[PDB]
């Protein structure tokens, strides 16, 4: 059911500091190589008044290269698919909640995404768009109450130098019973490869690899 080459379509609806927006996307990847990319377009609420970077990790752990010796919760959950929930706690009190419900239609994954950011300070790097990129990261994955958790210490590099820290807590939920993994890691590296001036168009890449 998992094919070597796969597509993606998605819609995100969200709000940051009570201002709504909508984004759509199409993309493609290689699930077994842990690579994907996508083009994203802002449909409503542009030009976004906040750092696009806060959204990019929300725009699928099926696109992660799992070796044979680690159970792959995500590829097993297909064709029924899985959903996830995430809280993203920024060091200045900015908090983002996100969810993604992932279904499969033919060779295409479909994402229905909600994003909700509150309490970003007007003079902070998100609302003044002073972020450069996310550093590559290592997510720690562990089972709890029959579902899979993933935690990660993330950092955004900042235009004047330095970093801005965010802690991610994700819960991933297969829509059917699957085998559960042991403790393991996923290395991630997410990059905006191109974009237009106000980020109404963005081309986003990620490569991920599981290890134990």
The span of 53-61, 80-88, 98-106, 185-193 binding Ni ion (CB under 5 A) equals 185-193
The span of 12-20, 82-90, 98-106, 187-195 binding Ni ion (CB under 5 A) equals 187-195
163 vs 189 by CB, closer to Ni ion: 189
Q: Is 129 helix (H, G, I), strand (E, B) or coil?
A: coil
Kindly tell me which residue out of 9, 35, 189, 205 binds Ni ion, with binding defined by CB under 5 A: 189
148 vs 208 by CB, closer to Ni ion: 208
Q: Give the containing element (helix H, strand E) for 41.
A: strand 35-44
d(CA 56, CA 192): 8
Q: Which tokens hold the place of 162?
A: 């330095």
Q: How far is CA 91 from CA 21, 35, 56, 60, 87, in A?
A: 24, 29, 18, 25, 13
Residue 83 pairs in a beta bridge with 101, 173
x-or-dash pattern for Ni ion, window 117-156, by CB under 5 A?
----------------------------------------
Query: Under the rule (CB under 5 A), what is the footprint of Ni ion?
Result: 189
């Amino acid at each position: 059911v998992i094919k070597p080459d796969m597509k993606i379509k998605l819609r995100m609806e969200g709000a940051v500091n009570g201002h709504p927006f909508a984004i759509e996307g199409v993309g493609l990847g290689k699930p077994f190589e842990g690579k994907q990319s996508m083009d994203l377009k802002v449909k409503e609420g542009g030009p976004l008044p906040f750092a696009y970077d806060i959204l990019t990790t929300v725009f699928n752990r099926v696109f992660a290269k799992y070796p044979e010796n680690i159970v792959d919760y995500f590829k097993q959950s297909f064709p029924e698919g899985y959903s996830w929930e995430r809280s993203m706690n920024y060091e200045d009190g900015g908090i983002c909640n996100a969810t993604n419900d992932i279904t499969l239609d033919g060779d295409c994954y479909i994402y229905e995404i909600r994003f909700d950011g509150v309490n970003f300070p007007a003079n902070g790097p998100v609302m003044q768009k002073r972020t450069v990129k996310w550093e590559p990261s290592t997510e720690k994955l562990y089972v709890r109450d029959g579902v899979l958790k993933g935690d990660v210490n993330m950092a955004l590099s900042l235009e004047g130098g330095g970093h801005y820290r965010c802690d991610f807590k994700t819960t991933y939920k297969a829509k059917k019973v699957v085998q559960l993994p042991d403790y393991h890691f996923v290395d991630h590296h997410i990059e905006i490869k191109s974009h237009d001036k106000d980020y109404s168009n963005v081309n986003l890449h990620e490569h991920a690899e599981a290890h134990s």
